Amino acid sequence: NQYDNDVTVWSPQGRIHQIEYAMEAVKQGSATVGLKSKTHAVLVALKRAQSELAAHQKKILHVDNHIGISIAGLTADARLLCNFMRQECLDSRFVFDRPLPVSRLVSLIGSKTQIPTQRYGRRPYGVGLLIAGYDDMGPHIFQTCPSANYFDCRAMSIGARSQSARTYLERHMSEFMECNLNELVKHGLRALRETLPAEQDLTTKNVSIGIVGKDLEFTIYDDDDVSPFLEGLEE
Amino acid sequence: TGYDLSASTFSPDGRVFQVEYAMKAVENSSTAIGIRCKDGVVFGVEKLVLSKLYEEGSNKRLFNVDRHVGMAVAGLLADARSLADIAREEASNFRSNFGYNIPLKHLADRVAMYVHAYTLYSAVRPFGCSFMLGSYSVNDGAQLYMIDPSGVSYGYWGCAIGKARQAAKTEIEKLQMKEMTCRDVVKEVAKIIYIVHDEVKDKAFELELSWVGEITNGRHEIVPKDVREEAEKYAKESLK
Amino acid sequence: SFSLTTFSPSGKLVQIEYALAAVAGGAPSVGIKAANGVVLATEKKQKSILYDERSVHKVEPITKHIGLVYSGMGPDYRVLVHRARKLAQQYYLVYQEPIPTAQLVQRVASVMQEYTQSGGVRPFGVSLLICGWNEGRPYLFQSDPSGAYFAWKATAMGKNYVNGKTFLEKRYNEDLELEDAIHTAILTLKESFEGQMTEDNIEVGICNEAGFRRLTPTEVKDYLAA
Amino acid sequence: TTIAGLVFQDGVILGADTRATNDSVVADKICEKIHFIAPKIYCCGAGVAADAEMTTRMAASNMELHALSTGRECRVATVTRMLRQTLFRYQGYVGASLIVGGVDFTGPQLYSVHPHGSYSRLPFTALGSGQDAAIAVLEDRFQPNMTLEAAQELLVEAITAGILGDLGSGGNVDACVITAAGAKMLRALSSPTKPIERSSQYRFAPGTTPVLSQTVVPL
Amino acid sequence: FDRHITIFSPEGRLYQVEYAFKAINQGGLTSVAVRGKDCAVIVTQKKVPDKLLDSSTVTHLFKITENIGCVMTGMTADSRSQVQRARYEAANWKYKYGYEIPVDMLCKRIADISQVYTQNAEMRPLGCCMILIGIDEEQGPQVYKCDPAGYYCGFKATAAGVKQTESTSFLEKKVKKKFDWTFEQTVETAITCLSTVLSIDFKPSEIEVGVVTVENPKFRILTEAEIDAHLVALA
Amino acid sequence: YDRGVNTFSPEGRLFQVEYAIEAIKLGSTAIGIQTSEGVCLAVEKRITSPLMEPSSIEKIVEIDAHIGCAMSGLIADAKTLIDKARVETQNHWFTYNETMTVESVTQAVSNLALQFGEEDADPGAMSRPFGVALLFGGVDEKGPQLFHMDPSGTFVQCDARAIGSASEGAQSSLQEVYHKSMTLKEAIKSSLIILKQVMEEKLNATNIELATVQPGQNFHMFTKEELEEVIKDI
Amino acid sequence: MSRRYDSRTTIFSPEGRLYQVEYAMEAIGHAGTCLGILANDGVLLAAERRNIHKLLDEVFFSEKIYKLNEDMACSVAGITSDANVLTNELRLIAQRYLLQYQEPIPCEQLVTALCDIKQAYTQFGGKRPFGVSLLYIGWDKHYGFQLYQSDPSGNYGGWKATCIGNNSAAAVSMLKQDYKEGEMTLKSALALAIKVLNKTMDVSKLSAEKVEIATLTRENGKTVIRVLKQKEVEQLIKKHEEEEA
Amino acid sequence: SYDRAITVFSPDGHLFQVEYAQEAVKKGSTAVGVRGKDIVVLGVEKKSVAKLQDERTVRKICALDDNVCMAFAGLTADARIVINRARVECQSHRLTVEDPVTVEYITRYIASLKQRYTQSNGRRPFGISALIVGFDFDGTPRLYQTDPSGTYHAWKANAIGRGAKSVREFLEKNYTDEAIETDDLTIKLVIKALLEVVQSGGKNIELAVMRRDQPLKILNPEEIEKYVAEIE
């Protein structure tokens, strides 16, 4: 009623509806999925076009040589926060001269989203993030929330209809560790299929991926390299 | 009525309901307990498994504010990590000021003062998290303090935060915790964790334990997996 | 930061309207300017014997030759005390002379105006009655929270102030010595005050060629003998 | 500029001269120095004239409300902390040399404030250009808790030595007595210099001035 | 409107200031302090609801400085906040005016702090009232009390908390009959005042009593052994 | 009302951003076309009375020599952008000494779209979202390109795009007339066909403005002479 | 900062008017009667006194009449609170003129300078507008004797004769009848103002204490401003008494 | 300080603030101007009452420069701020450029102030709309009107105030290539445009004209009655 007008005012149950409305803003975006092995990490992003004549939007943003991220949420809220993520990673190589640990970057992402919450007049950032990266300890899959909560993950699927993918991620989780780069793409694209409708399924136009690895830096694939990846995969 | 809208506006009975509602949010958080003895202070936390899709070690509920100072928070995780770094800034600025580790009573005061500062202003919101602060030293000894959402600290021989608290506090009163040693106290901590959790609403969980005292040489340290499993087997003697 | 005082549909200020209604129900206070001195007799009532009369005094001097009494809120008055005294300070800083009563009341009444405009702040709840002595001519001024300051030979303020004004209208006239000014100020004070009258219940002070001074309870008891 | 003070058994007396000079010449022969702070607390300035003037003005103004806000007697040590914090705020930019003495609830007390802000408690001292002449006289003949008349004869001779022993010190001697019973001001208590007369007079007859233009405006 | 922020009511009152009064009784405690000839004694109830609660960390008797004692009746969060600022103001007195602040000038600056909260709608007033004691070298012992409104006055004895009129009513029995006030005989009235109204008969471990005397100007809290010596002898 | 410009919906979308796109339906119709021989832009002057001078109405502005622009929606917010849009384009040549890619032109302008807020801002902060939609055409090292932005700041490469009140039926009509290799002059013909259908008035030589950019010719606005030769090919 | 406590005084009415500005002129409408007359040989400004009590002092000068500078003067109708700041600001503005230009300020410049301040507060700042309307008199080197009128909205205009406060429309109606442009001098305008003051004032028994009259004229190259003494006003009462009956 | 957003969007995207600002423009007095060949003529009705108010302070016809003048209809208080700030910037332009100010260069600055102050934090939209008319290089006249929303446009003939649409109906129909051909036709057309809104008008109508490089000249009321004397 009167308690949804701002973030600061607590509900009689001790909840903030504006944070809830920010967490429901992320679920209105595109559905992306990602996973990691004991060696590599693959981020499968679903691209959607505004119209039939319009080209597909870019859901993948390059951050660091070993780091990549997929955005789901308000587009511009991701952009301003992407300028914050890239600045902190550039500051890491500007100061420490090393790739910023992916766990340290996400902790800075939450601190940026904790600032608007406790203050009146500030809106929280309504974009969610699925970020991946490789370091001395191996690849890592991290997820963030507009509530500022962030978790460490083996594999996750965000967006609409993500449970059909997450259920797939639960059954094959045993295989995700020992598969190699070519199989991670096969499991990643087949995991994307469950978030997709029953009509439009898989085309190299609206489907793009990215891969980071042991000695392999993060690389974005679009069409030419994705076409043989889709070949040889049943649905 | 409009009286509970802002924390700066008092109720007709002379109370602030905004601070009260922040306390009700703490009651939904998972249960965390701690006990101090002559040997040190023992920590424990119930970490609920939300899904099997989460990596081991995720959502760590054992917070380390300072080398000799451990912390366990039950409440909003967003305000938890906020105050976590802020409490570390106060301990770091203390060392940058007085050149040693801040005592637990002095640290609990400065942190609680900054919690109460947001209850006065209507342009901000009070913290929705409550936490306990343990410490150990050779001059002071084992000490345990808990800070509520209203920013008031109380000394405790033991405390419980989260959903189930009064039930766990009475179980601690039934036996003397002072003469015990942290090896025997963690046996009771794991025993209480199994009593608090049953299968009704929640599904699965994991035991997160921490020690400070003579065993850890006065430094905040997590319990290893080897001792944790052995400490569970001592509780499995009776629960099972 | 938005102004809490706005114009009513009738043009009056709503906030200052309750400020004047607040000082109308304060502690009864009267004053008289007669001959070479001005008499200030106020009401300090204590609810119990435990109260120490020497700790808190309602009649306070602004400076040697100037003094002030009040009817209204306690807290808002002490804020007026500090700022008016600091204004007399900053006066003596620049001009290095005792401050005239006309200039003292003018710039202090301007402070009352500032909170009828600046936002997030309420107007003062105190109506000040100023006494001063300059160049051999006594001064009796009256200021209210509205910021408009007037001048009076004799007046009344506080609970039942209309009666005190009408009583001095009938009884008081010119050619009254300072001794008669005290005894007239007591008679008009007997009307507004109810109950037994002692030296602790009333706080009296005067201002003359020797400056503003507060009366001790010993000499007040001498005037309680009629 | 010779200013000095002495604490005796029953009180304290602050001496000063009447003469002020600007760098080539005497500005005023009768110019007063000792200022007013509290009825029982008095001070006197030195060094820069306007800086010592304005500083005592802010001191007397701050101490005035402290007497009005407390309603009690003023502490002499309170005056000194006000003076040096102003000197500290400007980092010694103010060249005011101030001596503060008086009688409080504790008793007669004399302090000293250097333009750099350093404060020292002491029974007797002197400040200004002629300070070394008065300090030497007060150092030799001082005795603990002297009689009021004995302290009056000594300090007047101390200022007299500070005058005769300084080029910037002259005129009459203004001594101010402060006792537990009350304070009393003595203006031009000592006048060591008799020759106040002159050997001739100058008068002009009307019409000896070459006036060119003349006009009258009535009022 | 007048009941949300602090502004003049239709009768010229302030309801936010009145609710600050009603916030005092919400503490659930009662304190009393009596001004004696050579002494000043504060008696308050020490509440330890939990067995695990450390008694040494729960104290209602506060020390502003050596010769000044303190006790707080009201919201605990506001109480400890004002005392910290009271120690900031008390030290500012000595750093400025040079000597230990008197109890009258200390209650004045603390009252001026509550005046700023009242006139300004930005900051809310504190729901705690402070009772200060001490001994001035001129007028002797000084016992004062400051409400959240900013009003303070010299009290021969003070009363606060749940019991107010009934606590004062017993204090009227002693002052009207003009009883001799000494160290023990003020402790005789203080314990009897709180015991008869609450129908308890406090034990030495249930209360804490601060004392200051002419011979001992340093404020000190009585030990349970001494309180027991002042209990049985007073029984 | 009872909310800030930063207040989220129960669905999680800003009200101020939603109403910004809804305000473009009140603007002027402009249809851009991307072809292999260049980028074509066309817009109607929308003259409601003979007393007005058509020279004062410029709905097609030139960002750079090879880079054009189109205009719709709110007029007040667009003029503000243009000075910045021109300035950042020259700041590019002032820094890197090269022509800014039209994708970077859309990138620098899209940054200032979202920046709007209330607290924790400067005096140069803007209160309300942009009510303007823009079309950036041009030719660069990659050839002719035509881009579009909305109040939310999203820029997307488009083969053909229409803006304004008639963009609902014009965008659907662009898919019909655009096939494979269709040239600039053929796109100009199809541009006047769709534009004449969507306007309520009659198509005239001085009623609409037509400007095209080519790989071998700088962005050029067709004068009244050439406009009469273009309309007579219908 | 709570947006419920903001009335947003910058809101336009559906007719395009400002509420706080219209409520300001209504408060001025209750102020006492104040008028002025521009005449050939001088300017005349007279006003009544609404506060009447036997214990009043009034040891000062006039009530609603102030002196802006050597060559100018003003009257006051409105809230006496906002009048004190405006009187201070007008004097500050007229003096800041003396800084740069070092000449007596033209009567047109001082008016538009304060009005720019009045409209700035109604434009932004959130502070309430001013509730005082002011009349201005004086002499300048260019236009000579001048009489102006100001409104709290910041609007102003030149006037040969006008009236503000109570009974304003009644005095204006009489100015449209008796006042002779370019004919009646300062002497004839003095008898005319007293006639208008007595007829428009329903309160009987007009006394030298109940009314106030001030004159400003230039004589021998010097601006002469003065306020008629109560005996001098009583002499004018004896003159008008015979005229009246 | 006072910082908040004043002008905010509605469900339809329209701005209630700006719309109410334009309503105050409609209630202003009627002012008109017309571009001639080498000349431009501005005029406004005046509502003076009983020979009381002075005619020196009423003038709504203001000059931004020797070659640029203007007239306004709206709140007379907001116009004095815009006219002053426009003249400060117009001459600051002549500081930056030795050449004079083109009418289009001052119009873009003026309307820009109505853009900023409308959307600025805590500020207020202007309730005025003015005709900025002047002569560009070579002597080509230009006529521009601003908008409280901040938009501006070019006009051969334009009018503002009450009945502004009615005056444009006269202008729209009677303005042809025959119109404003010579000086006698330009003067009559501007007067005949005001003859419809005449209500107890007489001398009260005020007119001004500027010719090539000559400064703005005000046509005295006696010649007004002589030009109104010929209606046939």
Numbering used by the authors:
A (entry chain F): 4 to 238
B (entry chain G): 6 to 245
C (entry chain B): 7 to 232
D (entry chain 1): 40 to 258
E (entry chain A): 9 to 243
F (entry chain E): 8 to 241
G (entry chain C): 1 to 245
H (entry chain D): 2 to 233
Sentences from the paper on this structure:
We then in vitro assembled the purified human PA28αβ and bovine iCP into the intact PA28αβ-iCP immunoproteasome complex in the presence of glutaraldehyde as a cross-linker. PA28αβ was observed to be ~90 Å in diameter and ~90 Å in height, and to consist of a central channel of 35 Å in diameter at the 20S-binding end and 20 Å at the distal end. Additional local resolution analysis suggested that in both capped complexes, PA28αβ appeared less well resolved than did the complexed iCP, indicating the intrinsic dynamic nature of PA28αβ, especially in its unstructured apical loop region. Consistent with this proposal, both gates appeared to have adopted a partially open conformation in our double-capped PA28αβ-iCP-PA28αβ map. Thus, the binding of the PA28αβ activator to the iCP was concluded to have induced a partial gate opening of the iCP.
In contrast, PA28 (also called 11S or REG in most organisms, and PA26 in Trypanosoma brucei, TbPA26) stimulates the degradation of peptides in an ATP/ubiquitin-independent manner. However, lymphoid cells and cells exposed to cytokines such as IFN-γ alternatively express three homologous subunits (β1i/LMP2, β2i/MECL-1, and β5i/LMP7), replacing the constitutive ones, in the 20S immunoproteasome (iCP) particles—with this alternative expression resulting in a change in the proteolytic activities. We determine the uncharacterized cryo-EM structures of free bovine iCP and the single- and double-capped PA28αβ-iCP and PA28αβ-iCP-PA28αβ to resolutions of 3.3, 4.1, and 4.2 Å, respectively.
